[PDB]
Amino acid sequence: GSSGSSGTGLRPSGTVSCPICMDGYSEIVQNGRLIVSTECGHVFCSQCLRDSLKNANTCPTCRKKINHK
Numbered sequence: 001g002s003s004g005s006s007g008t009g010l011r012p013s014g015t016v017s018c019p020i021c022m023d024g025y026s027e028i029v030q031n032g033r034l035i036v037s038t039e040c041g042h043v044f045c046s047q048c049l050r051d052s053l054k055n056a057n058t059c060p061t062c063r064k065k066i067n068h069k
């Protein structure tokens, strides 16, 4: 529910980053696309990635044999 916690911020750890739409996290998870991941070791979006596989089977970043089946 809505506890109502008032903290300071969020650890500098980091936030997902998609080179396809070069957009942050909130945006992606803003009722548009789902945050997906790959084996190669990169982060992408549901649409972005799903679309890449159609165009360039290999990762649009490392371009390494990638397949989830």
Ligand SMILES: [Zn+2]
Binding pocket: 018, 019, 020, 021, 022, 023, 044, 045, 048, 049
């Ligand atoms: Zn994306």
Ligand SMILES: [Zn+2]
Binding pocket: 038, 040, 041, 042, 059, 060, 061, 062, 063, 064
């Ligand atoms: Zn990759």
